[PDB]
Amino acid sequence: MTEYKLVVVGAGGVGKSALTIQLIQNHFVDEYDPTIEDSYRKQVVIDGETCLLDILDTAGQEEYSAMRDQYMRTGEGFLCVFAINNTKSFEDIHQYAEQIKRVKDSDDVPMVLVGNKCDLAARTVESRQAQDLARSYGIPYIETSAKTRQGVEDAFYTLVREIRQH
Numbered sequence: 685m686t687e688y689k690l691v692v693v694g695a696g697g698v699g700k701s702a703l704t705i706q707l708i709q710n711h712f713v714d715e716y717d718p719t720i721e722d723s724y725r726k727q728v729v730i731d732g733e734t735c736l737l738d739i740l741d742t743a744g745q746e747e748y749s750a751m752r753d754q755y756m757r758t759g760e761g762f763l764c765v766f767a768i769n770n771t772k773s774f775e776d777i778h779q780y781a782e783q784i785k786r787v788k789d790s791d792d793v794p795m796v797l798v799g800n801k802c803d804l805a806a807r808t809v810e811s812r813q814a815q816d817l818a819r820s821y822g823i824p825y826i827e828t829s830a831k832t833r834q835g836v837e838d839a840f841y842t843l844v845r846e847i848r849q850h
């Protein structure tokens with residue numbers, strides 16, 4: 685069966701771990717335990733095809749930024765996550781995308797831009813602004829809530845599907 689190496693990246697506290705765990709284990713993590721680097725694997729059927737998701741959950745804390753080159757080298761598709769209630773996290777997205785783009789020596793690396801925590805009402809990043817960023821990269825924008833499960837499967841499966849267009 686095909687195996688897809690997905691990497692989830694973005695600023696700390698945007699909900700990377702919560703997204704991943706919601707996808708893989710089907711529950712919401714309410715507490716905030718900052719991640720160093722964790723791995724998850726799950727057989728899923730996507731568009732008729734049995735396949736293996738290998739998902740790397742990465743550090744948002746910038747002290748662990750040295751570890752980025754290593755996972756950006758290995759990973760096949762990148763979930764680029766900001767929180768819609770954290771403008772700074774949206775501004776941080778570029779640093780992640782550029783580095784992926786640099787490290788992979790490609791302007792065409794499978795990516796999906798994810799606006800997380802769309803259940804919260806304190807939005808400071810309007811959808812249209814994220815859509816504009818995603819358009820410049822030539823990638824999809826998808827809003828998610830790790831809390832309600834809205835968009836969680838869409839976001840990850842779209843990433844698997846971007847890896848398949850490439």
Ligand SMILES: Nc1nc2c(ncn2[C@@H]2O[C@H](COP(=O)(O)OP(=O)(O)NP(=O)(O)O)[C@@H](O)[C@H]2O)c(=O)[nH]1
Pocket residue numbers: 694695696697698699700701702703713714715716717718719720742743744745800801802803804828829830831832
């Ligand atoms: N309301 C709401 N809270 C969320 C959502 N996703 C994550 N959170 C909350 O935000 C906090 C941070 O979540 P977490 O997944 O650990 O963030 P992270 O991006 O993995 N952090 P790190 O980079 O340090 O590993 C947690 O308290 C979590 O419950 C979401 O969609 N909605």
Ligand SMILES: [Ca+2]
Pocket residue numbers: 711712713714
């Ligand atoms: Ca919980």
Ligand SMILES: [Ca+2]
Pocket residue numbers: 808
């Ligand atoms: Ca504004």
Ligand SMILES: [Mg+2]
Pocket residue numbers: 699700701702717718719741742
């Ligand atoms: Mg985490």
